[PDB]
Design a binder for this molecule. Structure first.
Ligand SMILES: Nc1nc(F)nc2c1ncn2[C@H]1C[C@H](O)[C@@H](CO)O1
Ligand SMILES: Nc1nc(F)nc2c1ncn2[C@H]1C[C@H](O)[C@@H](CO)O1
Ligand SMILES: Nc1nc(F)nc2c1ncn2[C@H]1C[C@H](O)[C@@H](CO)O1
Ligand SMILES: Nc1nc(F)nc2c1ncn2[C@H]1C[C@H](O)[C@@H](CO)O1
Ligand SMILES: Nc1nc(F)nc2c1ncn2[C@H]1C[C@H](O)[C@@H](CO)O1
Ligand SMILES: Nc1nc(F)nc2c1ncn2[C@H]1C[C@H](O)[C@@H](CO)O1
Lengths: 230, 230, 230, 230, 230, 230
């Protein structure tokens, strides 16, 4: 159907959970979904569709970086009529009060990428998570009573950032964590009148290096229950 | 105490409602606050402090534009130890599905200003409303059962914008409304580890010109009840 | 007539003196104008029209920051057919040879705002004071024999500037003082084939903190006599 | 050893061929390398190391987009002491005289990404392929007598580009093709005093949609023979 | 003494008239200066020093474009202790009310160059002519009673400008004429606490193609008399 | 024929060698060309046309800076139907391993100018030397067996650069040398479907100050022999 997806309209659920690691997407499908069926493996992206508590749900990799997820998210909303995309995964803590293993729900994401400026006449576009998705994630977190921090994220184009001062600047403004996709995903959902959100588990702290399964499994519970709520 | 405020630490409540029109700030104090006392009138900004349901609350003008509100908000958080600032007022609808008299609660605000780029190493800072404030405003709206749209706002530096295409672009990305302060307020609250939010009543639609009191009074109810919740 | 002005065409003189502080605009009207009449008080902006030496002249506030004065100046030139706008007020000295109480006449104004780039295809627009207005101000200064420094000003979007190095950089390039409106006013006057100028009294020095009435009154004399000359 | 590579120093040859599709990297290893051994599969990136004509050579995926390849290339040069990275793969033709199935060797690559500006003080960095690698690729092409076009490439951050006019602009300046990694790879090689190059087979034309194996196999021959020459 | 000047401190007068055409600088020296002596001809720049009405004055070419004049002007102020540089020459009319053969005195100059942003922390630097020089030029014009237009100029980096819309935009903002050096010269004079100005004769109109000696000679009279006044 | 060239179509050879110093262009014509005839001296640019080994070849100055060479190169390709332009001259070494008197052949050139961003929708244009010209220059160097370094150059708009850190940054990325024209020339050649290249002799090192004829003559040999090859 698309240059990066062999599936056809209908193969994907209206709600898709995405993570960077394709092998993680596979593990998520085998571990949390019932009757998971591989609907797309172009570039070994591991796109699966199954059910959770009887409801259709898909999980698929999205690569690393804004350019990668922008391709996948746009095709999903446009061609496969997906309605909600929830990014699930890991991130690097920024704020000094955020620690490894913490779970973070993004209200929005800043970025050092030029993509949003290109689509927004060189102005400041606020890459904002869909309010419904933020609410569903927070409520799921409250209902499951799992501690989660809600706040700004940052999507960097440079995992290895030459601008060593940025990290401290972001800590001063209290950015919670860094990843590489949210800032790109959110504006695309808006353009298609669809929804997007992001929830991550801190795998490390960038201002000082500091069980990882429990945190990851708790995050998956929140994302999954939230997907049902939506 | 400051170049723009004659009051001293303690004269302002920890929660301050702000609007552009100083005469509106005065009207709000006389109409909704009990025992309102003028605590600052430098530049006729009309800064009052009184109580609502027994709790201390201040209301004050903030001028028009990001540069103006940045001055007031920074002094309030820094010098007067204010904790929460809620911008209340009017805005221009962008989205075709948003209409005059509608009430909008900002999750965040985009901007064509350079202020956030200056404070954020020329990168994209997501001017995001404090999640607690967004929640308090939405809950107040739900409890009072007043219909309100939640979504992105846009703070323009140019009321009379030469870039006539921007309006349609924003409608495509579903920006809800335009005002001139939010994008500046939000990042300042973050820097001071404080809180900020914005709620407005659409006074007109910018893509087509289309009782105004009821809407304004309903908005004031939401802001006020939210202030108590916080 | 406009969203920020209740007056109608003809209520404003062709020459308008503007300052940020609305209460100062009121004081100027009562102190220097004869038969001053309030022609606009939307947002308590204090717009007055009277006469000086028999000639019609208006005085009105313009708020703080480029976005604010851009609104007022554009409406005045466009709707009220005003021909000349002279910004009168205070500023912060930059240059080491400029001192508090000094009077400065701007030849032009630099800025860290994005407004001029937006209206000038992202190029460098030289926010220049109208040569006629600069001349009228200097001649008035010479005729009244009041010492005044003529040179570049800087209109900042950030009263509290995070870029602490800018101040010293501007001192090296000999910027005379900082305010928050000129860079916005000048290009608007050009667009409407009208005129604009700026004259200020240094209320403080930003590189080192260092009677204020005499200086302010002397500045008002220059502006007023210049207004007559024009 | 690294967050994206489980291999240790020595597992990778000093020359690494990279492509976006991990499944293609696997196919290349099984088809052209002798005794190929999987040295890294973190994120299913398919990193293999074997020999070609007796010389050690590695092949591995690099994901889509500059942020992705920047991670992989920097770790390879820095941690695994790789000396030469040759990007092999597909691209979209831009120039009207370039056609589907054509083989293109990049002298350099332009981009709409902000990465190079971030690492080069906001100036214009010329993402240039290592001259040795360009020469090796061209000579291999000449020796194998396989027609190949040499010229500028373009690495876009947006596969689905909102700026529809860019394509025609690039055709006027004669950019040969578009991909999503070269502009990022080249500057990284320079920083590490290492080498990088790119060769692609046009899978389609972006200005008009227009056997694919022969072209791909011919490209692989050039890259492989060039790798030996280096 | 410098890479572009073989003269030594003292060979140049404190006032230097500069034009792009080296052959014009030579003609000016032979035609208006008494006892003109060649003090520098590196790169055939034709730097002369003589006297006008008994006062020392130099004339020299400066090449075309901001980068060229920046080299010459900086060396002159820094090494040769020159105090005033007056650019004399030709320009292209922009404004519809400006015509070929008209004489224009620049109050300032806009530009599409990046030089001023590089020296001014990426902000808007107002390339302003020294007020003393503008005054001297205008007074000379008034005393000689030669009609001259005073206003903004524009220094383009592109004689052949791809942005065909810029011309009309500048006409709307009433830029008087275009040349290629002023925007660079003015900020350099400021940095060295020196002076600079520009006066040109329109050789053609860029919005519509439309004796040339009289205009040029009249301009030279103004510049020369102004040089004496300074 | 053009505002900067009095010659007519046919007066210039299809191959033109250009240098900044007009007196050097004259010396090159008298020293290496047979029957050199002055075909253009507007602005004393010294444009000559003669023959080398029987083939028509022109040499002419181009001034200093991108704006200057852009004028000359565009007129030459457009009006005089020139096919190949080779910039010959001097440059300042950047890389620590490059020394004074070394000969450098540019594969491409970076820049701090805004010209390429203006012509390339504000994106990163890779100012690349024509591959044919790079090859001809390298082969000539190999055939004459003259040691020459091939790599990136940098065209600065500021000979006297305020950004003192740039030099070290460029050394880290291994830029070979700095000049002031290449970045402008290369994109123009592309637009006209023509060719351009650059070869220079290091006259000094910018990171530490460190016979000059031999190097210059060797460079001229390479350029000349290359011109014949093309
Ligand atoms: N500390 C960290 N920093 C950055 F920039 N990204 C982090 C991260 N931890 C996880 N991620 C997520 C985002 C990318 O897809 C991928 C990068 O390894 O995994
Ligand atoms: N349609 C509209 N457009 C913009 F730009 N701002 C609007 C508005 N309606 C209200 N506002 C708010 C924001 C400023 O403080 C002030 C500007 O009049 O009131
Ligand atoms: N030191 C100073 N710095 C800045 F930025 N602005 C100054 C000032 N002194 C006076 N002003 C003028 C301009 C604004 O309207 C307002 C800001 O208080 O008053
Ligand atoms: N027409 C085309 N346009 C763009 F932008 N990239 C193209 C392409 N054909 C192949 N590619 C390469 C680059 C990415 O890794 C990936 C994107 O599908 O494959
Ligand atoms: N119409 C025109 N446009 C531009 F851009 N520059 C003009 C000009 N007429 C004269 N000049 C001056 C400036 C350069 O030094 C040189 C360019 O030919 O002469
Ligand atoms: N060290 C150096 N730095 C820079 F920026 N340019 C250099 C140079 N050596 C020679 N050039 C060439 C380029 C200009 O045309 C002219 C500048 O003098 O000569």
């Amino acid at each position: 159907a698309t240059p990066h997806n062999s599936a056809q309209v209908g193969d994907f659920a209206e709600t898709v959970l995405m993570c960077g690691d394709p092998l993680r997407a596979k593990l998520i499908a085998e571990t949390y979904l019932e009757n998971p069926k591989l609907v797309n493996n172009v570039r070994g992206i591991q796109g699966y569709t199954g059910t959770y508590k009887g409801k259709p749900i898909s999980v698929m990799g999205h690569g690393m970086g804004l350019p990668s997820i922008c391709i996948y998210a746009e095709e999903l909303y446009s061609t496969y009529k997906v309605k909600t995309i929830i990014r699930v995964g890991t991130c690097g803590a920024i704020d000094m009060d955020i620690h490894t293993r913490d779970i973070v729900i993004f209200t929005s994401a800043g970025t050092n990428s030029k993509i949003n400026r290109i689509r927004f006449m060189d102005h400041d576009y606020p890459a904002t998570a869909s309010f419904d998705v933020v609410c569903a994630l927070v409520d799921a977190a409250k209902e499951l009573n799992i501690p989660a921090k809600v706040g700004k994220g940052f999507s960097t184009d440079l995992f290895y950032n030459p601008q060593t001062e940025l990290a401290q600047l972001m800590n001063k403004f209290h950015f919670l964590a860094v990843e590489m996709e949210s800032a790109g995903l959110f504006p695309i959902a808006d353009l298609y009148g669809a929804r997007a959100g992001c929830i991550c588990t801190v795998s490390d702290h960038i201002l000082h290096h500091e069980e990882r399964q429990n945190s990851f499994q708790n995050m998956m519970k929140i994302a999954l229950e939230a997907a049902i709520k939506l």
